[PDB]
């Protein structure tokens, strides 16, 4: 329990920061790719997943890769993520994220469900095996998912 | 009452279409501009407005132009609108719009509230008085707000 200075308290650093801008560009050639991929994977270990997304709605877990009611979330979330990227240390990062915390905080998205996304995201970054991408991204992206994920709070405000 | 072919049944035409792509570009220099402007206006004639948006939440109708919890909706909705623009005759326009129809259809957004947005949008286009912009945009944009607005249905499905 805390009541803090609420900002994404230190967004890595300029030296670490810069990478997630030029890396995002590379991995977001594939708006339907990297994210729909990042998602079919989360759905394979977790059960709890495929039922809490209204439009994927319990119809067929495993069969995926792409088709109709899923190519929609592939982009929907991805241009809006290029909004979080664009607002990296730009004031409206609090108010932006909070309307999104209003979404997830409803259903029952918490600390369990979050460490599905954030380590399957780590695996997506392996398939772009252009040899050993530096350990500063293996700190940095881990440091981002640690401070940007709904600024940690969702149900954390008593 | 109908059960139709549901698509945005004829998105104007290539001849009319083209304009809303090169016009969108001009008017979406100002992501916080044109939309926050398009919105402060809706709020001046309608009462019903300023209370149904969770983040503008009843605190001060008239004072606006910009500040914190409103510069957030200014962009949020605008990159996602460049998604509808980008998907003009691209299959995922049904599934894209429908998750958005799921949002508005909840509260009580209907045919009344819609002809606030769509004629205040007409007025925004006047302030870009670069002399008399052709009557084909004064058909076309009127023809778009007539077929893209949550593909008309929201509460229209019995
Ligand atoms: C960096 C990670 C994530 C971000 C920033 C993100 C982003 C988004 C976005 C943009 C939306 C739409 C919000 C709106 O309605 O305005 C969304 C929807 C959703 N998210 Fe998160 N998401 C993330 C992680 C997760 C995780 C780990 C869960 C875990 C349960 C999750 C579950 C959902 C659900 C249930 C929806 C509803 C889909 C709908 O009907 O539109 N997301 N997310
Ligand atoms: C071309 C016109 C419009 C479009 C495409 C549009 C788009 C959007 C978008 C992108 C959202 C966020 C949906 C989400 O949660 O994922 C939104 C929210 C909302 N819209 Fe619409 N809008 C339009 C017209 C209107 C009108 C005329 C009303 C009338 C009442 C309205 C009221 C709302 C409300 C109540 C919100 C909730 C804001 C929030 O808490 O995020 N909008 N709209
Ligand atoms: C969010 N998915
Ligand atoms: C929608 N505003």
């Amino acid at each position: 329990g805390a009541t803090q200075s609420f900002q994404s308290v230190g967004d890595l650093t300029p030296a670490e920061k810069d990478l997630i801008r030029s890396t995002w560009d590379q991995l977001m050639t594939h708006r339907t790719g990297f994210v729909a991929d990042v998602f079919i994977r989360i759905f394979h270990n977790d059960p709890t997943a495929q039922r809490k997304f209204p439009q994927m709605a319990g119809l067929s877990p495993a069969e995926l890769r792409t088709s109709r009611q899923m190519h929609a979330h592939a982009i929907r979330v991805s241009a809006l993520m290029t909004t979080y990227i664009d607002e990296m240390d730009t004031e409206v990062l609090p108010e932006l994220l909070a309307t999104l915390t209003r979404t997830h905080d409803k259903n029952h998205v918490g600390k369990k469900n979050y460490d599905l996304f954030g380590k399957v995201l780590m695996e997506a970054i392996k398939a772009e095996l252009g040899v050993g991408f530096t350990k500063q991204v293996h700190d940095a992206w881990a440091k981002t998912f640690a401070i940007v994920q709904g600024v940690l709070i969702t149900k954390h405000a008593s």
Side-chain angles (χ1 to χ4, degrees), chain A:
Chain A
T3 7
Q4 64 250 7
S5 311
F6 86 86
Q7 298 92 14
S8 308
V9 160
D11 234 64
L12 291 30
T13 35
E16 289 202 330
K17 195 183 295 153
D18 223 284
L19 251 320
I20 73 164
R21 215 284 311 189
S22 288
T23 273
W24 186 262
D25 276 282
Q26 274 204 57
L27 335 184
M28 209 186 67
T29 41
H30 285 65
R31 297 225 291 231
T32 296
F34 142 91
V35 226
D37 210 277
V38 163
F39 284 123
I40 51 162
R41 286 173 111 164
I42 300 166
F43 301 130
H44 278 23
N45 177 114
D46 196 24
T48 323
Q50 271 252 345
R51 95 174 228 68
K52 278 148 62 64
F53 288 90
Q55 46 285 91
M56 282 46 103
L59 288 198
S60 297
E63 62 135 53
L64 241 37
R65 223 322 244 178
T66 336
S67 186
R68 351 205 66 116
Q69 218 148 126
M70 175 46 143
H71 172 235
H73 185 39
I75 301 182
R76 192 169 235 280
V77 84
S78 224
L80 219 147
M81 213 128 107
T82 318
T83 320
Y84 289 122
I85 294 294
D86 256 327
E87 258 44 52
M88 198 111 67
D89 39 63
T90 313
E91 209 196 296
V92 96
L93 162 58
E95 303 278 30
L96 203 56
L97 213 1
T99 307
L100 196 98
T101 306
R102 281 259 316 326
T103 324
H104 306 57
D105 177 35
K106 284 181 198 64
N107 268 350
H108 47 278
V109 177
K111 198 77 170 176
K112 202 80 232 168
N113 282 85
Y114 274 130
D115 220 283
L116 263 145
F117 197 108
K119 185 86 80 189
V120 172
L121 161 138
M122 215 134 288
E123 214 177 292
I125 256 161
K126 258 92 236 77
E128 203 170 87
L129 182 88
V131 160
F133 67 106
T134 210
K135 57 182 71 75
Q136 174 255 51
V137 167
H138 190 35
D139 203 303
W141 262 88
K143 207 63 171 62
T144 340
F145 196 78
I147 319 189
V148 182
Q149 59 162 250
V151 198
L152 181 278
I153 290 150
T154 204
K155 193 293 292 175
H156 280 77
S158 37

